[PDB]
Design a binder for this molecule. Structure first.
Ligand SMILES: Nc1ncnc2c1ncn2[C@@H]1O[C@H](COP(=O)(O)OP(=O)(O)OP(=O)(O)O)[C@@H](O)[C@H]1O
Ligand SMILES: Nc1ncnc2c1ncn2[C@@H]1O[C@H](COP(=O)(O)OP(=O)(O)OP(=O)(O)O)[C@@H](O)[C@H]1O
Ligand SMILES: [Mg+2]
Ligand SMILES: [Mg+2]
Lengths: 196, 194
């Protein structure tokens, strides 16, 4: 006679739900891989487009997610740049979304999209700083690698491809990507765009 | 009190079914993912065309599948395949998909008898004493992810012949078939000489 079966039902519930969450993450990856890979197929040769209109697009899509976070986005005027507008909005997309996703629940999170002539063909470097949780400054090189997550899927579910994608789009443009982080303080990612 | 377990009896059968159904879906989905990635690596592995023995390719493809061939109690007439200027890996891939498809779609009433010949552009053929298909569906036959069969009685991924066509077309060839439902079908592909 089984007291055991009653315990099996507890364990079954765990596993069936494990397959269900483990299979949902697999669906997310399949989608993120299909959206981002089709961008390369739709690639157009670069022309000069206003980066401010592109940014205003990204603030349109995120208009639900921004209010959800009661976050304030201070948007400076972004110049023209010679780039692929569809692909560069995704770079703004993924970056503003990460600054929203990793908002810290104790302070109203504020995001800023700056523009400044960098130095390292003069390239304008666009930067997005946010007051978020940040990550450990040991991870600056690792962060841009795919599927290289810093924490388990318990606290944040993601695919690990978002920001590694940004790097390769910015690299098709002959730019670089980089980040400064202050754990607990906030993190700022930036990417450069070449001129000519 | 028995009603505690009178309940268990009726459900445990279903659970075994359902979980086993989910198990097949996980095999099928993994097969598809793998076959697509093998395909993406084949495009990467493209090497410029050279002269390869087409009979060597046949014997390799006949090597991997000889486990599946003994399973099938089928007879292979392995004719002499000449040289042709092509990619060895990709043409090995094309022989597999056709010979494997010709093994998979065999008739359970007849020992399927298979013929791999070549007849002059050089055209290579695989004739099979297997199932036929109906000429109303030839567009489906070559369409990717459109199989003519449900997954229960015949397993597969649906990309096999769409794969072959991109290979044979990268070689400047054709894909084509004559079919006789119930008797058998013979698929063929051509290669340029120059
Ligand atoms: N603003 C940020 N603050 C803190 N960590 C960040 C920030 N942006 C990115 N990260 C780190 O980047 C790691 C992976 O980034 P990435 O954006 O590529 O993936 P993701 O957010 O998990 O998922 P997805 O691909 O769906 O966007 C995250 O685990 C997080 O640690
Ligand atoms: N020798 C054959 N005899 C009859 N029908 C065939 C034969 N070879 C292929 N077909 C038909 O072609 C359809 C698609 O063939 P194809 O080989 O491309 O895919 P598949 O065998 O279903 O999958 P995969 O090769 O990805 O495992 C098959 O469903 C089958 O109906
Ligand atoms: Mg992201
Ligand atoms: Mg096949």
């Amino acid at each position: 006679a089984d007291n055991i079966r009653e315990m099996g039902d507890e364990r079954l519930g765990v596993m069936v739900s494990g397959i269900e969450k483990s299979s949902r993450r697999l669906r997310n990856l399949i989608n993120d891989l299909a959206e981002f890979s089709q961008l390369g197929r739709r690639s157009k040769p670069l022309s000069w487009v206003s980066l401010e209109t592109v940014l205003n697009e990204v603030l349109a899509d995120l208009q639900p997610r921004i209010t959800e976070a009661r976050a304030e986005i201070q948007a400076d005027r972004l110049p023209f740049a010679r780039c692929d507008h569809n692909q560069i909005r995704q770079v703004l997309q993924n970056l503003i979304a990460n600054s929203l996703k990793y908002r810290d629940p104790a302070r109203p999170c504020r995001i800023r999209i700056f523009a400044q002539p960098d130095d390292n063909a003069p390239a304008i470097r666009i930067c997005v700083t946010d007051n978020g949780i940040g990550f450990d400054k040991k991870y600056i090189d690792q962060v841009f690698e795919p599927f290289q997550r810093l924490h388990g899927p318990d606290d944040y579910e993601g695919s690990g491809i978002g920001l590694a994608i940004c790097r390769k789009i910015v690299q098709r443009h002959g730019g670089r990507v980089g980040v400064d982080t202050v754990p607990g303080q906030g993190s700022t990612f930036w990417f450069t765009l070449p001129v000519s």
